[PDB]
Scaffold this active site. Structure first.
Site, mmCIF file in Angstrom:
data_model
loop_
_atom_site.group_PDB
_atom_site.id
_atom_site.type_symbol
_atom_site.label_atom_id
_atom_site.label_comp_id
_atom_site.label_asym_id
_atom_site.label_seq_id
_atom_site.Cartn_x
_atom_site.Cartn_y
_atom_site.Cartn_z
ATOM 1 N N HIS A 9 -5.796 -1.180 7.897
ATOM 2 C CA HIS A 9 -4.537 -0.537 8.255
ATOM 3 C C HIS A 9 -4.484 -0.406 9.773
ATOM 4 O O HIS A 9 -5.162 0.445 10.354
ATOM 5 C CB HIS A 9 -4.461 0.834 7.594
ATOM 6 N N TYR A 55 -1.266 5.225 13.067
ATOM 7 C CA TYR A 55 -2.599 5.745 12.782
ATOM 8 C C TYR A 55 -3.569 5.284 13.874
ATOM 9 O O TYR A 55 -3.150 4.746 14.898
ATOM 10 C CB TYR A 55 -2.963 5.442 11.325
ATOM 11 N N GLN A 115 -7.124 -0.735 1.020
ATOM 12 C CA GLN A 115 -6.654 -0.525 2.385
ATOM 13 C C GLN A 115 -7.490 0.550 3.078
ATOM 14 O O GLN A 115 -7.492 1.710 2.652
ATOM 15 C CB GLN A 115 -5.170 -0.163 2.426
ATOM 16 N N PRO A 119 0.842 -1.210 0.000
ATOM 17 C CA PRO A 119 0.000 0.000 0.000
ATOM 18 C C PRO A 119 0.870 1.249 0.000
ATOM 19 O O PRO A 119 1.824 1.340 0.772
ATOM 20 C CB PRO A 119 -0.787 -0.121 1.314
ATOM 21 N N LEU A 120 0.542 2.216 -0.864
ATOM 22 C CA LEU A 120 1.409 3.386 -1.062
ATOM 23 C C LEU A 120 0.580 4.638 -1.282
ATOM 24 O O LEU A 120 0.024 4.831 -2.365
ATOM 25 C CB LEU A 120 2.322 3.185 -2.267
ATOM 26 N N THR A 121 0.548 5.512 -0.279
ATOM 27 C CA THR A 121 -0.054 6.833 -0.418
ATOM 28 C C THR A 121 0.675 7.636 -1.495
ATOM 29 O O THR A 121 1.905 7.783 -1.450
ATOM 30 C CB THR A 121 0.048 7.560 0.927
ATOM 31 N N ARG A 142 8.506 0.719 -2.695
ATOM 32 C CA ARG A 142 9.243 1.670 -3.525
ATOM 33 C C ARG A 142 9.668 1.070 -4.865
ATOM 34 O O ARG A 142 9.648 1.764 -5.891
ATOM 35 C CB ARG A 142 10.444 2.196 -2.740
#
Ligand code: FMN
Ligand code: CL
Length: 381
Positions: free
Chosen positions: A174, A179, A98, A23-25, A319
């Protein structure tokens, strides 16, 4: 003949390999937090990963903390996400959404009515937060009332309904990286004296209530959960992480979930860290009996070793997948990897998002064809 490339059966979901897009914001949502055709292209491009886990997606505006992250709480957002899942599925991919609530990692500028961010306890994280009006110091959040936890749990339930409507194969909770749920888990951030605080059992209560609620929407074998058992990211701390995460992982084992997704301690949220810890995937493999995803700092060789030695079932890459939409094909061919450009991770446009090249231009062309067809099919009139 890399095990990374072996097809994997995830309780009926035939994946193409054992590699996962972490998962990647990316902060690239359209107006009103709605996914766009550009987002559909990005995920379609990466459909050759065995499983895609989306960027963290807020279940409510209260659950948001960064600009232009997508939501899953309005019908317009559902419609945008359906464009994404359509394009992924036309490329024979598999995708889980997510579900996010940022908790205290936010600013009142993002919140309904300028309200404070919410948290288990009124403790500001250290440092600063990016807002629409520039960088600002973090505020002290409002501690949730006991009765309000059920309403946040209901927001997760509604988000799962919308995920199922959007067209997601599954959802990931998540519960990592500082968080809301992680803040409840750890005693450095959770000073509560109600049934959500004190004992390890009470600290994890909210996680099990969230799982209870979303499992009324999706079957348990399509609900995953992500944990960071040993990170300092976003001012997190706990007095006994081995006991906390041993308990949590053992209880999650009984829940018949899709998978448990663990972040290695050598990652501090979005960067590499020098960190000594025993709470890596090897510690937790004997404690969890289902599908185990390991993520954080992996390369081809180290990911393959995790699978060969049976410390995990799937390996997530973040990444490298940003920069290499066809990462599995590059591993298979021993091809060089495109370098990832940290300057274009967050916000912006196609640059550093959909313009990283493929080995085979036909792969790029097919992703574009399916994104364009999905936009035409699902366009709001
Ligand atoms: C730009 C960026 C965005 C990220 N966004 C999320 C996110 O939305 N949700 C999450 O659980 N982890 C997120 N992470 C953490 C990654 O999923 C992953 O654990 C981390 O990048 C380490 O894996 P890697 O070495 O393969 O990149 C993000 C990381 C980066 C660099
Ligand atoms: Cl994160």
């Amino acid at each position: 003949m890399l095990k990374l490339l072996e097809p994997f059966d995830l309780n009926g979901l035939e994946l193409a390999n054992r590699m996962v897009m972490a998962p990647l914001t990316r902060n690239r949502a359209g107006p009103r937090f709605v996914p766009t055709k550009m987002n559909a292209l990005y995920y379609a491009q990466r459909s050759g990963l065995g499983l895609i886990i989306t960027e963290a997606t807020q279940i409510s505006q209260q659950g948001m903390g960064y600009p232009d992250t997508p939501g899953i709480y309005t019908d317009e957002q559902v419609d945008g996400w359906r464009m994404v899942t359509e394009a992924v599925h036309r490329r024979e991919g598999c995708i889980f959404l997510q579900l996010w609530h940022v908790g205290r990692v936010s600013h009142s500028s993002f919140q309904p009515n300028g309200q404070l961010p919410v948290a288990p306890s009124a403790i500001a994280p250290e440092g600063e937060v990016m807002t629409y009006d520039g960088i600002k110091p973090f505020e002290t959040p409002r501690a949730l009332e006991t009765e309000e936890v059920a309403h946040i749990v209901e927001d997760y339930r509604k988000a799962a309904i919308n995920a199922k409507r959007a067209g997601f194969d599954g959802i990931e909770i998540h519960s990592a990286n500082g968080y809301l749920l992680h803040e409840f888990l750890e005693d450095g951030t959770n000073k509560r004296t109600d049934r959500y605080g004190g004992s390890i059992e009470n600290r994890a209560r909210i996680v099990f209530e969230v799982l209870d609620a979303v499992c009324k929407v999706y079957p348990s074998r399509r609900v995953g959960i992500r944990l960071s058992p040993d990170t300092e990211f976003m001012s997190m701390s706990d007095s006994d992480r081995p006991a906390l995460y041993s308990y949590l992982v053992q209880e999650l084992s009984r829940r018949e979930l899709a998978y448990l997704h663990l972040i290695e301690p050598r990652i501090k949220g979005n960067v590499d860290v020098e960190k000594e810890s025993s709470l890596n995937v090897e510690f937790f493999r004997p404690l969890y009996k289902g599908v185990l995803i390991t993520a954080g700092g992996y390369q081809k060789e180290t990911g393959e070793e995790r699978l060969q030695k049976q410390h995990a079932d799937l390996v997530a890459y973040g990444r490298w997948v940003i920069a290499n939409p066809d990462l599995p094909s590059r591993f298979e061919q021993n091809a060089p990897l495109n370098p990832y450009d940290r300057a274009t991770f967050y916000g912006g446009n196609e640059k550093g998002y959909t313009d990283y090249p493929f080995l085979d231009p036909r792969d790029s062309q097919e992703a574009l064809k399916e994104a364009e067809a999905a936009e035409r099919k699902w366009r709001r009139l």
